[PDB]
Structure formats: C-alpha cells, structure tokens
Design an enzyme around this catalytic site. Structure first.
Site, PDB file in Angstrom:
ATOM      1  N   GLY A 269       0.824  -1.203   0.000  1.00 15.44           N
ATOM      2  CA  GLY A 269       0.000   0.000   0.000  1.00 15.44           C
ATOM      3  C   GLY A 269       0.863   1.260   0.000  1.00 15.44           C
ATOM      4  O   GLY A 269       1.977   1.267  -0.533  1.00 15.44           O
TER       5      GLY A 269
ATOM      6  N   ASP B 156       9.150  -6.888  -9.952  1.00 15.86           N
ATOM      7  CA  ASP B 156       8.567  -7.753  -8.928  1.00 15.86           C
ATOM      8  C   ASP B 156       9.457  -8.962  -8.678  1.00 15.86           C
ATOM      9  O   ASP B 156       9.770  -9.728  -9.597  1.00 15.86           O
ATOM     10  CB  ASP B 156       7.171  -8.227  -9.348  1.00 15.86           C
ATOM     11  CG  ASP B 156       6.126  -7.148  -9.210  1.00 15.86           C
ATOM     12  OD1 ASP B 156       6.501  -5.983  -8.932  1.00 15.86           O
ATOM     13  OD2 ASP B 156       4.933  -7.462  -9.389  1.00 15.86           O
TER      14      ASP B 156
ATOM     15  N   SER C  92       5.602  -5.800  -1.127  1.00 14.01           N
ATOM     16  CA  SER C  92       5.794  -4.353  -1.283  1.00 14.01           C
ATOM     17  C   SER C  92       5.912  -3.775   0.123  1.00 14.01           C
ATOM     18  O   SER C  92       6.728  -4.270   0.922  1.00 14.01           O
ATOM     19  CB  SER C  92       4.649  -3.787  -2.154  1.00 14.01           C
ATOM     20  OG  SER C  92       4.854  -2.430  -2.523  1.00 14.01           O
ATOM     21  N   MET C  93       5.118  -2.772   0.503  1.00 10.58           N
ATOM     22  CA  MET C  93       5.248  -2.199   1.833  1.00 10.58           C
ATOM     23  C   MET C  93       4.953  -3.225   2.922  1.00 10.58           C
ATOM     24  O   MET C  93       5.419  -3.077   4.060  1.00 10.58           O
ATOM     25  CB  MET C  93       4.338  -0.979   1.950  1.00 10.58           C
ATOM     26  CG  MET C  93       4.467  -0.170   3.237  1.00 10.58           C
ATOM     27  SD  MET C  93       6.157   0.379   3.623  1.00 10.58           S
ATOM     28  CE  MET C  93       6.496   1.614   2.421  1.00 10.58           C
TER      29      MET C  93
ATOM     30  N   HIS D 233       9.726  -4.973  -4.440  1.00  7.70           N
ATOM     31  CA  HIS D 233       9.818  -4.253  -5.712  1.00  7.70           C
ATOM     32  C   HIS D 233       9.963  -2.760  -5.405  1.00  7.70           C
ATOM     33  O   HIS D 233       9.950  -2.338  -4.245  1.00  7.70           O
ATOM     34  CB  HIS D 233       8.613  -4.567  -6.627  1.00  7.70           C
ATOM     35  CG  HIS D 233       7.298  -4.024  -6.144  1.00  7.70           C
ATOM     36  ND1 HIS D 233       6.114  -4.251  -6.816  1.00  7.70           N
ATOM     37  CD2 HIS D 233       6.978  -3.258  -5.069  1.00  7.70           C
ATOM     38  CE1 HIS D 233       5.123  -3.644  -6.179  1.00  7.70           C
ATOM     39  NE2 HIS D 233       5.619  -3.037  -5.115  1.00  7.70           N
TER      40      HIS D 233
HETATM   41  B1  6V8 Z   1       4.080  -1.215  -2.605  1.00 11.57           B
HETATM   42  O1  6V8 Z   1       3.443  -1.479  -1.434  1.00 11.57           O
HETATM   43  O2  6V8 Z   1       3.330  -1.624  -3.686  1.00 11.57           O
HETATM   44  C1  6V8 Z   1       4.913   0.161  -2.664  1.00 11.57           C
HETATM   45  C2  6V8 Z   1       5.842   0.494  -1.462  1.00 11.57           C
HETATM   46  C3  6V8 Z   1       7.350   0.269  -1.596  1.00 11.57           C
HETATM   47  C4  6V8 Z   1       7.864  -0.506  -0.383  1.00 11.57           C
HETATM   48  C5  6V8 Z   1       7.765  -0.532  -2.826  1.00 11.57           C
HETATM   49  N1  6V8 Z   1       3.914   1.213  -2.781  1.00 11.57           N
HETATM   50  C6  6V8 Z   1       3.999   2.268  -3.582  1.00 11.57           C
HETATM   51  O3  6V8 Z   1       4.942   2.520  -4.300  1.00 11.57           O
HETATM   52  C7  6V8 Z   1       2.811   3.203  -3.482  1.00 11.57           C
HETATM   53  N2  6V8 Z   1       3.300   4.495  -3.857  1.00 11.57           N
HETATM   54  C8  6V8 Z   1       3.309   5.558  -3.064  1.00 11.57           C
HETATM   55  O4  6V8 Z   1       2.916   5.546  -1.920  1.00 11.57           O
HETATM   56  C9  6V8 Z   1       3.869   6.788  -3.718  1.00 11.57           C
HETATM   57  C10 6V8 Z   1       5.083   7.231  -3.219  1.00 11.57           C
HETATM   58  C11 6V8 Z   1       5.627   8.363  -3.806  1.00 11.57           C
HETATM   59 CL1  6V8 Z   1       7.121   8.935  -3.188  1.00 11.57          CL
HETATM   60  C12 6V8 Z   1       5.014   9.028  -4.859  1.00 11.57           C
HETATM   61  C13 6V8 Z   1       3.803   8.605  -5.368  1.00 11.57           C
HETATM   62  C14 6V8 Z   1       3.242   7.477  -4.783  1.00 11.57           C
HETATM   63 CL2  6V8 Z   1       1.746   6.963  -5.467  1.00 11.57          CL
END
Ligand code: 6V8
Ligand code: 6V8
Ligand code: 6V8
Ligand code: 6V8
Ligand code: 6V8
Ligand code: 6V8
Ligand code: 6V8
Ligand code: 6V8
Ligand code: 6V8
Ligand code: 6V8
Lengths: 179, 179, 179, 181, 179, 179, 179, 179, 179, 178
Positions: free
Chosen positions: C56, C159, C85-86, C110
């Site tokens: 997320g 991924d 991811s997060m 990723h």
């Molecule tokens: B994932 O959970 O899919 C990922 C988190 C990292 C650990 C890979 N999530 C995102 O990339 C979601 N994106 C954002 O929160 C985001 C961050 C920034 Cl700096 C700019 C725009 C967006 Cl939409």
C-alpha cells in the site's frame, strides 16, 4: 439540408453567409473561409452575414471579427431570431450603416464567462486573462456603438436583453428592417 | 476499528487526538469537538495531536488551527507518515517547542488550490479570495517558522517535499523524535 | 467478524495486532493507535504483528514503521500468506531476531509505484520525489537485511517473489516458523 | 445474522471451538479465520477445533495464511465439507488433521489449477507466469502429500475443473470419511 | 427488524428458524449454524423451519439439506408464501410426516439453471456437472416424495407450479395446515 | 465520531451545539431539537452555538433562526473556520453582544440562489418568491448589523468575503475572540 | 462544410491551408500531406497557413514544423482567433518576415504537459523525456524569436497570454496585419 | 480531409503512403493494399512511406513489414513527428540507405506489451508467446541496425527515447534529412 | 480508405480479396459476395485471398469456406500478419499448393469458444452443439493438413502459436513466400 | 429519405416541409429556403407545410420575421400537429392562405423556460420570458383577431383545438376538405 448545391452553398453563390449556430472553432473556420473565398471572387461586392446565434467562444468570434475588418468587401450583418453574447458582438461588427435586425429579433449582451482550476497562481493567471479579454471586448463594442466603455461595462454586468428597436437605439445595429 | 471504547476513544482518554485522514468539515468538527472536550476536562494538561494527513479544506483546517490557539492547554503535534498542505500547516501550529516528526515522516508545503466557474466578475472575486487566503496562510506560516513571507511564498510556489530533518531546519517542527 | 469483544479486540488483549489488508491511511492510523495503546499498557512485553498484506501507501507504511522503531516494546513480525511491497518492508522492520514467516508464506519486494500529471516542471518534482523515496526505502532495507544498497536496487527493479526460506536467506526475516 | 443470550450465532459456535468458513476466501476472511484459530489455541491447546467449509475458493495466499496456521497450532483441526469445497476451499479441506477430514454425503468437491492475470511488458508477463507456475507446483506438492496421489496425477487431474462427489473425494484422499446420517 | 433480542432471535429461542429469502452461501451459513446450535442445546426436541424462498444456489441448499439429515432432532418444514426451486427441495427435506404448507402457499419445482463460458472443453465440463447435479437432485426428490425419477424428470423440465393441496398429493409435503 | 456519549452528545451536556455542516432540513431539525431541549433543561443558562458552515436552505436556516429568537436562553454564536451564506446569517443571529469569530475564521455574505422551471407564469411565481425572500433576509440582517437595507443589498449582490475583523466592523459579530 | 470542392479544398487550390483545430496525429497527417502536395504542384510559390488552434501533441506539431522547414516554398503563418501552446510554436515557425496575426488574435505560450504512471524508474524515464522535449522546444523558440533560452524558460513556466502587438514585440510574429 | 481525390489519394498517385496513426489491423490492411497496388503499377520506382505513429499491434506491423520486404520496389521510410514502438520498427525496415528522419522527429524503442488472463497453463502459453515475439523482433532489429541482440535487449527493457541524430547513430535510420 | 475506386475495390479488379478483420456475418457476406462476383466475371482465373484476421464466428467462417470450395476458380490464400482461429482455418482452405504465409506471419490454432446460459437441458444442447462443431472443424482440418484428427484435437486443446515455417511443416500452408 | 431527395424535389415546386421540432438548425434551413425561393421568383406563392410540436421561441421568430419580410405570400398548411411555436407559425401565413387538414390538431400555450442562479439573475430571466410572452400574445392577437386578454387566458394551460376550432379562433382561415 435540402439540395438545389446544398441550400447554403446556393446562397453562398449570392454572397450570403448563414451563421445559425453556436460559435466554436469549426464554425469560425468555416465562416472565415467563406469570407476569404467571397473576397477572392469579388473584392468590391457586399457580403451578407445572417446571424442567428446564442454566442460561443470569444477567440472563435474574434477570428470572424478580424476577418470581417480585414477584407475589402463590406459585410452587412442581419440579425434574425437571436444574436446573443458573441453573436451580438459580431452583429455590431458589420459595415457601419449596414447592420440590421428583423423586427422581432432579440439581441443580448453580457460579460464573458469562463472557468479556472488549479493553484492560486493559475487561477490568478486565468482571472487576469478573462478580465483583459472583457476590456478588449468593451473597448471594441464602445467604438462600434458609440457608447462609453463605462456604460458598456455597466450594461453587460448581467444578461441584458434588447429588442431590435432597443438594439438600434443602443448603436448595436443601424436599422430595423421593416416588411 | 478495534474495541478495548473504540481504540481512538481509548486514546482520547489519555488526551491523544488522531488526525489520520484528509481534512474536511466533518473531520474538523470532530477534532474541534475533541479539543474543546479535552480542555473542559482539564485546562492545564497537554494534548497530543498526531498528524498523518494529505491536507484538505483551508477553512476546515483553520477551524482546527484557531481552536488550538484558543484553548488553554498546549497542543503538541506529532507528524507520522505524512503532513502535507493543510496537514503541514497544522503540524506547524502546535505549541512552540512541542512540534515533532518521526524520523521517516514526510512534510510537504505548497500553495492553495481551487476552482472558479462563471462570469469574468465572479472569476475575479474567486481569484482575489484565494490569493488573500494564500497571504493569510503565508503570514501565519512565517510567524510559526521564523521564515520571511517572501521565502514562504517562493518555497510554496510548487509542491515542496521536506524530510523530517529538513522540516526541523525550516522551522515547521522543533525536534525529530529519535527512537 | 465474530464476537467473544470482536475477535481482533480479543487478540489485542494478548498484544497481537492483525495487519490483514492493503496499507492505507486508515489502516496505518489503526495500527499506530494499537501500538501506542499496547505500549501504554506495558512498555516491556513484546507485541506480535501478523502481516498478510499486498502492500500500500509508502507514507502510511512509514507511519507504522516509525512507530515500531519509536516504542519501547519489541514488535515481532509474523508473515502469513503474503507480505508484498510495503508489507514486506514492515515484515523486515520487526525486532531483529523476532521476524518470522510461516513455511508457505510468500514475500515480494519491488520498487515504488506512482503517477504524475501536469506541467513538465510538476512531473519533474514528482519524479524527484518518488526517486528520493526509493533511496530512503533502499537505505533502510539495506540496514534491516544486511544487503548492499546496490543489491537491493537490483533486486527490486521488477517484482521479485521470495519463498519464506529465500526471505530468511535474504535477511528479510530471521526464522521460518516450523510446525 | 441471529443472536443468542450476547452472541451472534457464529460467536456462539466459536465458544464450542467451531469455525464457519462459508464464503469466498479473501484476505479479510483469512484474517478472521486465522484470528479464530489463534484464539481457540490460546484458550485450550489440546482440544480439537472444527472447521466447517462451504466455499467456492479464493486467493491462494489468503488460503495459505489459513493453511499454515492450521499446521502451526497444537490443536487438531477437523475439516467438514458441507455444500461445496472448490479450488482453495478443497485445498483447505484436505489440510485438516489426518483422519479428521470429512464431507457430508451430498457435498461437492472441486479441484483445478490456479487462475490469474498479467499485464504489461513481456518481462513482467514472464515474471507473473513464473510466479503462478511456481505457485501451482507448491500447491501440487502439498496436495500430493495430503492425499497420497503423485504430483503427476495431481497435475493431470487439475488441468481443468474436476468435480468430485464426497465418495470420490474420499477415494481420492482429499477427505478420510463421508459422514453418514 | 423489531426488538422484543431481535424478533428472529426471539423465535430461535423456541427452536424456530425463519428461511425467508434467496438461498445463497451466507443464508446457508446462518441456517446451518442455527441448526447446529439448536442441536447442541437439545438433541431431542423438534426444530421448526419456516420456508418462504424463491430458491437459490444448489450447493448452498445442500449445505442446509445435509445438515438437516445429519442432526439428531427432527426438523419440521412449514411452507408459507412460496417454496420454489431449492426452496421446494428443502421443504421436501423435512422430517417425514412433519412437512407442511399453509393453504394458499405455492410450491414450484423445476430443473437447475446455470451458465458456462469458454472453450468447448470447459462448456462440456460445465454441462456434465450441471446434468450430474440434476440427477442427484432427482434421485433425492424421488426418495423424499415417492415419485419415480422419470416422473420427477418429466415434471421439472419446465417451471411447474403446485398448490399446497397438489404439493401434498405429489409427496412434497405431508399435510396442508388448516386454520 | 469518538466516544467518551459521542463527543457531540458530551458537549451538548455543557449546552454547546456544533453546527459543522451544510444547513438542510435534517440539520435544522436536529439543531432546533437541541435548542428546545437545552431550554427545557434550564431556561436561564446561555447556549453556545459553534458555526462552521458553507450555508444551505433558507427555510431550514429560518427554522433555526426563529427558534433562537423564540427560546428564553441567550444563544451565543462562535464562528470557527467558515460562516457563509445562511451560516453567516445565523452567526449574526446570536444574542447581541455574544456573537464571536475566531481570528482566522472567514465570513461570507451574498444573495439567495435558486432555480425555476416551467411556464412563464410559474417562473414569475418563483422569481417573486425568491426576491421577497431576499428582502426578508436583508431586513433582518439590517436589524442585526445596523447597516442600512440598501447597503446590505449592495454588499450581497456578489459573493462578499470578510475577515473576522471586517465582520466585527460590519456588525455581523461583536468581538474577535483573541487567544 | 459548404460546397463551391468543399470550401477548404477550394482554398487549398490557392495554396491556403486552414489549421483550425487541436493538433493531433490526424490533423498533422493532413497538414503535412497538404504541404507536400502544394510543394509538388509548385516549389516556388508561397503557401499560406492560417492558424486558429488551442495546441495539441508536441510530436504531431513537430511533424508539421519539420515539414515547413523541409519544403522549398515559404510558408506564411497567419494567426486568427488564437494560437496557443503548439499553435503558437507553429505560428513562430513561418518564413521569417511572413509571420502575422490579426489585431485581436491571441497568442499563448507555456511549457509542455504530460503524465506518467508506473514504477519509479518509468516515471523517471517519462520525466527526462518531457524535460528534454521542453529544452528542444525552448532552443527552437529562442532561434525563431531572438529571445534567450533563459527568457523563454521563464516566460513559459505558467500560461503566458500575449496580444498580437505583444507577440510581435516578442518575436513570435513579424507584423500585425492591420485592416 | 481536403479534396484535390482526397489529399492522401493524391499523394498515393506519386507513390507516397502516409502512416499517421496507431497501427492496428485496419491500418495495416490499408498500407499493405497500397504497397501491393503501387508495385502492380510500377515494380521499379521507389515508394515513400512517411511514418508518424505511436506504434500498435505487433502482428499488424509485421503484415506491413513483410509486405515491404516482399515487393520489388524499394520502400523509403521518413519519420516525421514520432516513430515509437512498432512505428520505429517499421522505420528501421525501409530500404537500407533510404531510411530518414526529419531533424526534430523522435524515435522510441521498447519491448512488447500484452496481457494474459486465465489458468496458470494459459498464462504460461501467453508468456512464452510474447517472449518468443520479443526474440523475433530483436533478431530482426539487430539485422536492420547492426547492433547485437544483447544490446537491443538491454536498450528496450524500458522506454528508450532517441533524437533523430541518435537514431542515425543507432542504425535505425541512415540520414537526418536537413532543410 | 484511399481513392484511386477505393483501394480495396481497385485490388478486387485484379481478383484480390482482402480479409483484414474479425470474421463476423457482415465480413462473411462481403467476402462471399466478392467470391461469387469474381467467379461470374471469369470462372477460370485464380482468386487471391489475403488473410490478416484474429478469427471470429464459426458459421460466418464456414459461409466463406464453403463458398471457396464451391466456386470453379482456385482461391489462393496468403497469410500476412496473423491468421488465428477461424482465420487459420480459412488459410488452410485455399487451393492445395496455393496456400502461403509471409515469413514473419503468425498462425494460431485452438478449439472453439462459446457460452451457454439457462436450464440444464439448454446447457446440454449448447454443449453438444459446440462439441459437434469442434469435430466438424477437426475432420476438415485433418483433411486439409494431412494430420490425424487425434493430433488436431491434441494440438488445439489450448492456444497453439505457429511460425510460418511451422505452419508449412504442419500442413496449414504449402509455402513460405520468401522475398 | 428517398431520391434530388424528396424534399429537394418539393422545394423545386416552392413547397417547404417543416416536420420537426423548431430549433436553430431547423430555422436556419427554413429561413434559407424562404430566401432562396424569393430570389428565384419574388411573386409566386410559397407553401409551408407544418407538422411540428413547437420549439425555441427565437428560432421560431427567425422563421416568422422572414415570412413577413419576403415579397411572396407564404401559405401555411397544418398536417398532423401544430403545437406551441408550430401553431404560432401556422397563424403567421398570408391572411386568407392559412389551412389545416380536417383531423390536424392545433395547440396553444404560454412559453416555457428555466432559470438558475442568484435572485437577481432569476429576476432577469423571469422579466425576459414574461416580456417574450407579451410579444407573442400581441402578435397572435393581431393574426387572429382575438383580444390580448383572451389570448392570455386561453394559453395559461395547454389548449388543444380541432381544425374547425382553430378556424373559429382565427388561427387558420379554412379547413381543407377532401
Ligand atoms: B508497494 O506497497 O506496492 C509500494 C511500497 C514500496 C515498499 C515498494 N507502494 C507504492 O509505491 C505506493 N506508492 C506511493 O505511496 C507513492 C510514493 C511516492 Cl514517493 C510518490 C507517489 C506514490 Cl503513489
Ligand atoms: B457569449 O457568447 O456567451 C460570450 C462572448 C462575449 C461577447 C460575452 N462567450 C464567452 O464568454 C465564452 N467564454 C470564452 O470564450 C472564454 C474566454 C476566456 Cl478569456 C477564458 C475562458 C473562456 Cl471559456
Ligand atoms: B492542501 O491541503 O492541499 C491546501 C491547503 C493549503 C495549506 C495549501 N488545500 C487547498 O488549497 C484546498 N482548497 C481550498 O480550501 C479552496 C477551494 C476553493 Cl474552490 C476555493 C478557495 C479555497 Cl481557499
Ligand atoms: B481457487 O480457489 O479458485 C484458486 C486457488 C487454487 C487452489 C486453484 N484461486 C486462484 O487460482 C487465484 N488466486 C491467486 O492467489 C492468484 C491470482 C493472480 Cl491474478 C495471480 C496469481 C495467483 Cl497465485
Ligand atoms: B432453484 O433454486 O432456482 C435451482 C435449484 C433446483 C434445481 C432445486 N437453482 C439453481 O439451479 C441455481 N443454480 C446453481 O446452483 C448452479 C448449479 C450448478 Cl450444478 C452449476 C451452476 C449453477 Cl449457477
Ligand atoms: B446560502 O446559504 O448559500 C443562501 C442563503 C443566504 C442568501 C442567506 N442559500 C440559498 O439561497 C439556498 N436557496 C434556497 O433555500 C432557496 C430559497 C428560495 Cl426563496 C427559493 C429557492 C431556493 Cl433553492
Ligand atoms: B500545448 O499545445 O498545449 C503543449 C505543447 C508545448 C508547445 C507547450 N502540449 C503538450 O505539452 C502536450 N504533451 C505532449 O505532447 C507530451 C505528453 C507526454 Cl505524456 C509526454 C511527453 C510529451 Cl512531449
Ligand atoms: B508498440 O508499438 O507499442 C509495441 C511494438 C513492439 C515492437 C515493441 N506494441 C506492442 O507490444 C503491442 N502488443 C502486441 O501486439 C502483442 C503481442 C503479443 Cl506477442 C502478445 C500480445 C500483444 Cl497485445
Ligand atoms: B476462433 O475464431 O476464435 C474460433 C473458431 C474455431 C476454428 C476455433 N471461434 C469461435 O469458437 C467462436 N465461436 C463460435 O462461433 C460459436 C460456435 C458454437 Cl458451435 C457455439 C457458440 C459460438 Cl459463440
Ligand atoms: B413552444 O413551442 O413549446 C413554446 C413557444 C410559445 C409560442 C408558446 N416554446 C418555448 O416556450 C421554448 N422556450 C423558449 O424558447 C424560451 C423562451 C424564453 Cl423567453 C426563455 C427561455 C426559453 Cl428556454
């Protein structure tokens, strides 16, 4: 719709242009093209521009307006039905002495309308633009009607409907065309 | 969601308010109500306002801001995750010396956003309003951070992201809360 | 859904927090609130954070991450099903030595994802932001796993799915919890 | 929906160590089932748990959250199929304590291969394909262990939707007994 | 809706279950749970299942059907309003001698309905499945009513509406409950 | 949202009513009911009405307004955030001397808005109605502020935004509440 | 719309091309085709390109731009109504000394706009692309107007509206065409 | 749109084909048909294929590509505006020595894109297909440019934008057409 | 789209039919009509059927197939781009020895797809229909290719992609047309 | 639809077919046909068939004022329905040359519109549509011989008239018998 040429092409042969819709970029491109063509055919003979229009884009209307003032032929303007907003601006733009309305035609004048979205800075840019556009329109309308810019500004703050006779008294047209 | 009281009601018992969403009128009405209630319970003990917010309505944010400055208790502000736009404005509004961010929290500042539709006159009114609102926000932010109004204006022309450490250097918070 | 307290409130009594969904601002506010509450109840006993999450918001995840590192109790992390991811970032954030996955749980890492729309200048601002956010995430993940930042960058370009055993070898967890 | 003296009907059955899995398996369903399993174990680590399964299936990872929790906890988890156990539902039915996996006589069991989607660059479609194929191998290996069938037979029998009666499910090794009246 | 317990919880105290909707998985889960609970409370006293239902999922209906046949208490079935499709199947499933309909209640029987989409091979699999399901339903209905499987097959080819009296003559119920 | 009573019920115990939304019939029904209840509890103690509202229905606002003037207790009005349109009308309706705004609160006044559709006769009826409603509002606002009806009419022709200090000079409030 | 040939085909006979819409790939394909055809008919006579356009695709505009610079005939550009964004870029691209605007025509210049979605890496690629495209546009506009690249950059950061006279001062056109 | 023949039919008389859109099956059918027709008219004279295209279907592009290589006439390719994805593939497919781009034209190369839904087995089939298609494209592009297959693979992993000069250095075209 | 006749009408003069889309009833009606017309013009000269098609309706394809086999002229089939599903069936239907594919053209074969919704009886009817249709297609494809029906059945269970060379080795075409 | 198209063929005989709602495009076409017929022959009658549910007041006045402007008499023939602005244009034909077929229907009523915004703007719109109604009533009074008071009373609601009633009213001169 009907064929004789379509009916409007047949009238264009007699130097009659029919502006019978909203003024957008496509309408302006057609009207400008008809004006340029009529001038290339004969740079001396009058053109007749019938106007039944609720208005439209300011820049599209100015494409038509500046073309009218550019070409050598006089362009008579005849309001039938309604000339509102940019439609009444173009009605006032005909050759002086050759601007007409039929007796029950309606003329409406008002200020420009628009929209703006985004940052404060961008809303400021859009506001300054539309206000400067309103001043440009008022200055020209002042010159075409003989009314002061102040009076034009007051009379366009809200929708202002005029009968043909009132439009003549205002200076938007020269004559009401009686039967 | 969970029950212990719901989890947020349980933390409100300890004078903790959680601002964890976009700031609209309903959110402001709840936060203001929690502030008034905490003050009525004890006018001396600190209140803790956690802020994880992308921002929201300027007037809703000012309902919260003016309530913070009105009540007797100090309101500590703790940024977790993100304080953006009106969220960073409220973070800067905590009791001086008691404004915090966790080390990886993000702060973002920028200028107000809006929209305007209608007559030139109405677009002008809306533009003057949002520009005056931006000046009000800049003056207050200048007072809370120690930066000049001119610097605030430059630094908010576009989205400006700050780390917690940068937010402390800027004057938006007083301390980065280390583990 | 079921009642005992709801089932999750009953487990919170035993210092178990269930993260079983996408990570958005509301989820983070709840998890942060549960962490703060568990610490206020007992600042020395371990907390258990079960993680089944597709990921997320980065800032919502950092609200949870910084709260974990802030509070006195150790937070054990247990991956069941999927930490992506997060979600895998928060799994790696548990107390060192107390990060687990069940044998058939899946871990995925990723790079961040986002979007940007507007002027070239604004797209530039958004690009710099998300790239700086990726560096922040890589630096922290490097510290939590023992892998170099260069390797983290390489392994998150696309991924990257890991079994529980691969996640342990990688340094994302400490142990696969056998039956 | 209904209430008992105060409990909802499912909360009342949870008091007797009965968990009702009666829907699609997504992350919220798995979170609840896992939480009920952990709670029942904390209450008594020795008494059996009863997991009724009427489910069309769902997410593979959500199902594995439930599966690994079943294998982790000390209590035996009996599985009872009523109505339908399809896809991940039949996988969880097969996951009950050996000897304590049941279906009622007219219950239906269906097994098949995973389903998914992939979108993007060739490289990303490749990554997604390898992932779902590796997930299918993981599922087949486990199902082979739980049923006694070879991995090659599991693979063949799941290429398309494969419906089994309760009696066929017992013969297959997915359950141990058909519960007669 | 009303509270006296809600009205249905109050009737469950007297071992009355109300099936008053379409039969889907959630409805079956609830009915099965109520049956199991009533049996755990007293394995010897009758249960009363009122049926007003247009039908629904075959597998959801079989979850209810097999639970009725599994538990020790007799389950009386009382049709009010309408028992159609799987609703009439469950009406026929009550304890023999204790299956009722009120005098103006309607019973409808017909064959299963479904859909299939995809490759020829998959449409074949779906067709064989639903045909085998129809045979299972006909065999059971034959044993509950005393009609031959051929007659059941003939009488369910299209929607077949029965009055309460016709339902008794058919063997779907034992008695029409007079006032 | 939070529980202590919900937070607003807890403040109602202290004779505080929170008007924090658009004014429609349901909002007015609730506010009127709270006013009547507070008066029945104690007809002598002040009531406090916080106002953060973009406005709303004129008749809903008059239900609140006439109830304020009817009941024996003084009703103090406190503007936080925004009192616009009917919101600023109700702010001006508090007990004279007990009408407040916080320093950054915004007040906006303008004329009524509506719509009409149908026969010329019906559009006439609707126009006369809304014009008579505007006169009623102007007369009352003139009494509450001390401004002439003509000045009220000029100052509401378009959206007119006022700072708290400007609202006090106008007569809409009595004091800006400093910290 | 009208027939004389359609009106635009009739003007193409006189080497007049009408660009009266947004610039997308189909519009560019037509304009390029008309330019190539006019050159094949006579490689020495001037072409006249009327421009009333809100702008459009950068690459579609460059297909037109590079074709103008490629062919042997001079291409005069005449702005009527509006030349905005890529429309003003093409206006500036006419044969030096033969770039015109009618007196009330409007010119607007600003920076490119776009969007980007996906991984951080992809957003970076899109950002670098649109920034490099902006540099390409600024370099060319600097050459065509005589303004420095830094001034072009500063004057296009936001929407910048110019009158015809201002456009001539700026170097975007050579003459305002008086009546 | 304009008439002379429509403008594109007039250029086809001079053996010019305009590819100015996405490449789908209808576009490919038309282009292939024009190529076959031009060859039947004269099997020796060059054909000129102008390319302004964002790309499109791989198989539609190969219908065009294989037709180019099949017919006796040389097909010159001229990039105006943008040749992206399959558009840049077809640009590289022109007769060696007769592949051009105008100076500000943009070329973009990247890997194929697609989608797959269904059973694991079907996703596998789709993945193998699109990967084999990428190898086919890389092998051909390697042959047409002189770059190694491994370099083509690395340079197409993400969107790769090239200026006309870079496209010539790469081997995608032979010459940048100067004015 | 272009005119010379439209481009496809011009090629029909040379006995070339372009099948460049999905095969539905309108496409089949046109192709059948072109075949009948070409035969009426000259019953001995070859017809050329170019095929770039993703497939379509089985019965529409059989209208084309049976017309090919009915008429006296040989119909050559040339695959460009893609012949998939019913498209590859029609490619295989050309005069033996006169079935071609260009070197990078793709051929795909698979089993029929459909849908069925209603009573068990109706799903059975639809299943038997589509299975009998698959047998009809396999028998014909077996004759046209020389492969056994059992091999055709195995090779069409899932989407089966073939290169032009593989299509020739399979018997779907006779020759790959080299440049 | 059928093939000149059928309406172009009738325009050759100075017949104009108004067979739809009256909007700006319809008015522009009708006005253009009237101007063209007059340019062809300024003396011969024009025939305007009217089957119309009505439409825009200003579009209708573009047609009305063009009828009164041009030299040729314009006969009006109602077939099917002349309602609202359609019945206004029917009444606008050359006096003595306004007809309806025996089962044709005529309907008269007052203008309809809408207004959104500030009280001030709703007032402006109300005054406009009321002044437009007075203009229509004055003209209809002159074309029919009824008093303005009677026109006002008879248009307060939808008022349907048979062809015979329309003749009695003064909206037409004759019912055209077979
Ligand atoms: B994932 O959970 O899919 C990922 C988190 C990292 C650990 C890979 N999530 C995102 O990339 C979601 N994106 C954002 O929160 C985001 C961050 C920034 Cl700096 C700019 C725009 C967006 Cl939409
Ligand atoms: B009207 O015809 O309604 C009117 C013309 C003038 C003469 C009153 N039209 C508009 O106001 C339409 N608005 C614009 O063209 C416009 C102008 C500006 Cl500067 C900004 C935005 C818009 Cl949308
Ligand atoms: B932000 O949180 O995104 C920002 C607040 C300041 C601190 C930059 N929010 C807004 O600007 C929201 N906009 C308004 O409240 C607004 C909307 C409109 Cl339509 C008109 C004026 C204003 Cl001031
Ligand atoms: B079934 O329960 O319907 C099935 C599970 C197995 C036992 C056949 N579910 C799925 O196949 C879908 N579940 C996934 O988790 C999934 C989705 C996607 Cl898009 C990609 C991969 C996977 Cl592994
Ligand atoms: B009825 O409730 O309308 C009817 C059951 C009768 C035959 C007792 N219901 C259905 O047919 C609902 N259909 C299914 O449950 C179903 C069954 C099968 Cl085997 C396949 C697909 C579907 Cl959708
Ligand atoms: B405001 O709250 O936005 C404003 C009231 C102010 C001017 C005191 N509201 C409205 O005008 C809302 N309009 C109405 O309630 C209304 C009133 C009348 Cl008289 C007729 C129609 C409508 Cl919709
Ligand atoms: B304008 O005509 O509005 C403007 C052109 C320049 C001269 C200001 N148009 C654009 O900027 C349109 N944007 C693009 O063509 C574009 C889009 C994207 Cl997503 C990426 C790159 C580019 Cl270059
Ligand atoms: B592009 O022009 O955007 C690109 C062309 C290649 C040369 C990079 N187009 C696509 O990738 C479009 N995709 C397909 O045609 C395709 C191919 C295959 Cl093999 C499978 C699915 C799809 Cl959708
Ligand atoms: B293909 O073109 O995708 C394929 C043809 C055969 C050669 C594989 N098309 C279909 O299967 C489309 N389906 C039908 O035309 C069809 C056939 C039958 Cl028998 C029943 C329903 C449908 Cl929809
Ligand atoms: B009718 O044709 O329905 C009627 C004409 C009169 C003779 C009864 N038409 C309308 O009333 C349509 N309304 C308008 O044209 C109109 C007029 C005014 Cl003044 C304001 C708004 C509108 Cl929408």
């Amino acid at each position: 719709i009907p064929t004789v040429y379509d009916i409007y092409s047949r009238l264009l042969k007699d130097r009659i242009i029919m502006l019978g819709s909203q003024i957008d970029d496509n309408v302006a491109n057609s009207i400008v093209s008809q004006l340029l063509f009529l001038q290339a055919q004969d740079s001396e003979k009058d053109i007749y521009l019938y106007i039944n229009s609720p208005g439209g884009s300011v820049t599209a209307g100015f494409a038509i307006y500046d073309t009218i003032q550019h070409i050598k032929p006089d362009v008579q303007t005849i309001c039938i039905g309604m000339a509102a907003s940019m439609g009444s601006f173009l009605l006032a733009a005909g050759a002086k002495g050759k601007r007409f309305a039929l007796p029950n035609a309606e003329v409406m004048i008002h200020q420009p309308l628009g929209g703006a979205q985004g940052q404060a800075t961008e809303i400021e840019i859009a506001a300054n633009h539309i206000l400067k556009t309103r001043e440009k329109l008022n200055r020209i309308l002042s010159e075409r009607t003989g009314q002061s810019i102040e009076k034009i500004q007051q009379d366009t703050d809200r929708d202002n409907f005029l009968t043909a006779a009132e439009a003549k008294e205002y200076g938007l047209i020269d004559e009401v065309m009686e039967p």
